[PDB]
């Protein structure tokens with residue numbers, strides 16, 4: 001689709017058979033989801049945003065379907081204010097900015 | 100233009116006599132610029148992201164040129180690590196997300 005920006009670009013994602021709302025976030029390098037359970041081995045990681053650094057759990061090669069487009073990649077789980085889809089997965093689904 | 104998201108979507112913006120690199124950021128409701136002493140009235144605000152909150156000064160009806168496109172609107176000025184063009188100005192320059 002084409003998505004305009006008068007509203008937050010929130011989309012439904014499917015991950016582990018669960019439906020969540022996430023923000024398409026071109027200013028985020030990474031995809032960061034609020035606390036949830038994901039299976040498999042994870043690595044402790046730290047990431048930085050506008051307010052400083054937080055600790056997250058890094059899961060690799062997690063499938064997410066974003067608006068019906070399939071991605072498989074790195075998902076960080078931790079205290080983000082909202083679920084965000086970052087550039088690592090935006091590139092996989094062919095998302096671009098256009099003006 | 101079309102901007103892919105393999106790298107950060109940094110573009111040149113102009114604010115008065117200052118040229119800066121800023122993120123085209125669909126995850127940002129409003130534009131946030133690095134500390135700078137802009138003329139005119141403003142109001143303090145707290146904005147939250149990854150890591151917590153920062154305090155900013157909200158200026159309204161500030162003209163910003165973004166890749167030659169004219170915009171005018173709210174700009175939040177504070178101790179952000181990166182200049183951020185938010186949805187409030189992205190819409191004005193005709194920026195959409197596409198996939």
Ligand SMILES: CC[C@H](C)CN(C[C@@H](O)[C@H](Cc1ccccc1)NC(=O)c1cccc(O)c1)S(=O)(=O)c1ccc(-c2ccno2)s1
Nearest residue numbers: 027028029030049050081126127128129146147148149181
């Ligand atoms: C709540 C949703 C967002 C977290 C809001 N922010 C916009 C993000 O795109 C942010 C941009 C960023 C990039 C690099 C360093 C610091 C920040 N990215 C990130 O936080 C980021 C950057 C790099 C890697 C990563 O894993 C995350 S944000 O930066 O916190 C933000 C912008 C405008 C906001 C607002 C609130 C009310 N009115 O306006 S809140």
